[PDB]
Ligand binder design. Structure first.
Ligand SMILES: O=C(O)[C@H](O)[C@@H](O)[C@H](O)[C@H](O)CO
Ligand SMILES: O=C(O)[C@H](O)[C@@H](O)[C@H](O)[C@H](O)CO
Ligand SMILES: [Cl-]
Ligand SMILES: [Mg+2]
Ligand SMILES: [Mg+2]
Ligand SMILES: [Mg+2]
Lengths: 393, 390
């Protein structure tokens, strides 16, 4: 039967913390899902262990939609990063099981392939503009068609995306950054030309009119996207940016629900939605987000940093392979130790991912190997202004 | 003055509660409610593993900076687990601040705006008649306001074994039955009594519009939680079609869950309580936004918010200009013993405490006598098996 016999979390730190849900059916078939929430990992682990897992036992594993609604509505307190990550982990494991039962790779189950490979972007970072440019050259040589560029801001010790369990404390100056950033993109274009796709992550630090100014300043450099311009709990925060610049906009890695972005999409305030499988309620929910996005010409650009496990990456590559309105897939390679803990069949070649062909999402976990790497607490940084004001990191 | 220690206490004197205690280098302490019904251990872990270590050494007096540090610093913002952890810290810090000031909490917030805090009681029964008996009984205790719920004939379970109980639901049967309850309450008890009703998420907007209109003759104090409101626009049809007052928000945790509801004048009462809404710091901002639009506070006050929340809420209720009403579900004697407090209930109303802080403490030795026991909230299915809203 497809009745659930067992379900449990695995916590491991093969270079960084990962939490994984495993679901095992009465017939012995199993599925896994990513439950990793960077810097708050044990909150999801406990949400799953104490409150979700006992309710999964005896459930029909084939009932994906019912389980999703049961956990989403049944929680009573709806949405949220801990909440939606727990739900995502269950959803991914159930889709893994369904695809295995169907004898198909996940992309086939979703509606089959819409493309022959999945374009990625790489992180190019450096202290100086020159340092970053060197990194762009290296990745272009590796075959990347797209690069995210970040560089230090002169007069500021720490800037995002440029180079102990408690939050590190960074210092920020918006005004210095606003004057410096356009110089980076100018230098990229001068050295590498127009065919390269160039991305930039603002990482929440601006107000809307400041982001509008930046967007206008970087129009000549034709960025693939300007990402996370402003905190967007208030979705209307995007409107001034959109009304003032034609630089394409990306947002959403911090979102967990379609209700965090319904308005952003329907009002045409963004070009790319960034919310990934692990944090956005899994395959079931993200299919719905991508479909809504498609009505408004919005494309997917999944958050793909290392704090999403190979389980998320494999499932995302399947999703990317099917989804009509695919935009790009972020690539941050995992460590060798992480890759070994999570055997998988997706492949990376010449700047692109290729989806696996084995039934399931194609990712597994080696539990005995995972057990060799105990959890190590690690928190994300905070950002303060020059006067000490607790700002957005 | 720095935080020297912070830790959670988990206890089950009749039901589960999670509490955060913060202690300073001068040996002063404060506590905050961290209870999230049916997901309690997620908050416990959020605090234990991720928040508590970052509190050590922080200036206890920096309430605002700490709130922002935890809220923005989490990176992943908002949510029930997140905002409850933040609320627990915030309540404990306000507790310490008031104690440092030598004042009960309401004094710190801006002083007294009213002499007492009106409550409502839960009145419930299988039949309308059963419910009416409960109303009579509560009116005799001095309640000026009652929430009324009764069973729907033809349906085994209506709103108002560690796993979710499974209830069955019929909207159509409820819609036809509910007006009869309010009619009976008015027929027996007259017009002076305030009468409330909790729809408990089960309707679509046009169904709630229909219900609102149908119950206009009974002049309800509020119709609560008509529809799931993740999509805040869900309230619009209800508001355009009825003048029955509307309340919502016990399942919210952020001002961003209700900013539009308030600004578009779609609701009359906001229900989000201190424990789940990010504590005093955040709820002051929510109540203040509400005030621009004639919206009043109606804090969720069920038993799954601890006496720590209740004491702090009574202080808040005593200060806030735009107070509407305070929900009252009495805690068990065992719960009251675990959480000694100085708020009082008299003649249908709360009276705020006068001792410095929010006036609530926790007896840790007694708390230890009641270990955690897993308990989940129910789910609701339609007659065809559809997983619905409970
Ligand atoms: O675009 C990105 O890749 C993200 O912004 C990351 O840099 C985040 O900071 C990290 O994933 C948080 O856990
Ligand atoms: O109005 C109320 O009192 C609430 O709706 C409660 O009945 C909730 O069901 C309970 O607090 C959930 O934890
Ligand atoms: Cl959450
Ligand atoms: Mg980013
Ligand atoms: Mg209610
Ligand atoms: Mg009209």
């Amino acid at each position: 039967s497809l009745k659930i016999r067992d379900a449990y979390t695995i916590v491991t730190c093969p270079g960084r913390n990962f939490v994984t849900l495993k679901i095992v059916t009465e017939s012995g078939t199993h599925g896994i899902g990513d439950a990793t929430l960077n810097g708050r990992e044990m909150a999801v682990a406990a949400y799953l262990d104490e409150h979700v897992v006992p309710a999964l036992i005896g459930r029909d594993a084939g009932r994906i939609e019912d389980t999703w609604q049961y956990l989403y509505r049944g929680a009573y307190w709806r949405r949220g990063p801990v909440t939606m990550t727990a739900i995502a982990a269950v959803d991914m494991a159930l889709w893994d099981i369904k695809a295995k039962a169907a004898g198909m790779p996940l992309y086939q189950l979703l509606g089959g392939k819409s493309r022959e490979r999945v374009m990625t972007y790489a992180h190019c970072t450096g202290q100086t503009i020159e340092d970053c440019l060197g990194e762009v050259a290296r990745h272009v040589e590796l075959g990347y068609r797209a690069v995210r560029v970040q560089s230090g801001v002169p007069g500021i010790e720490t800037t995002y995306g440029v180079a102990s369990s408690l939050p590190a404390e960074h210092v920020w100056s918006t005004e210095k950054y606003l004057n410096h950033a356009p110089k980076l993109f100018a230098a990229v274009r001068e050295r590498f030309g127009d065919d390269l796709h160039v991305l930039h992550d603002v990482h929440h630090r601006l107000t809307p009119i400041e982001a509008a100014r930046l967007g206008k300043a970087v129009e000549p450099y034709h960025l693939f996207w300007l990402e996370d311009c402003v905190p967007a709990e208030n979705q209307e925060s995007l409107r001034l940016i959109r009304e003032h610049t034609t630089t394409p906009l990306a947002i959403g890695e911090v979102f967990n629900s379609i209700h965090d972005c319904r308005e952003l999409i329907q009002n045409q305030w963004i070009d790319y939605i960034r919310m990934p499988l692990t944090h956005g309620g899994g395959i079931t929910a993200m299919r719905r987000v991508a479909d809504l996005a498609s009505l408004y010409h919005v494309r997917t650009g999944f958050h793909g940093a290392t704090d999403l496990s190979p389980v998320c990456l494999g499932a995302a590559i399947h999703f990317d392979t099917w989804v009509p309105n695919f935009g790009i897939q972020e690539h941050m390679p995992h460590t060798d130790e992480t890759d070994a803990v999570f055997p998988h069949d997706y492949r990376f070649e010449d700047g692109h991912f290729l989806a696996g062909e084995s039934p399931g999402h194609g990712v597994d976990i080696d539990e005995e190997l995972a057990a060799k790497y105990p959890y190590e607490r690690a928190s994300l940084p905070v950002n303060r202004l020059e006067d000490g004001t607790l700002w957005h990191w």
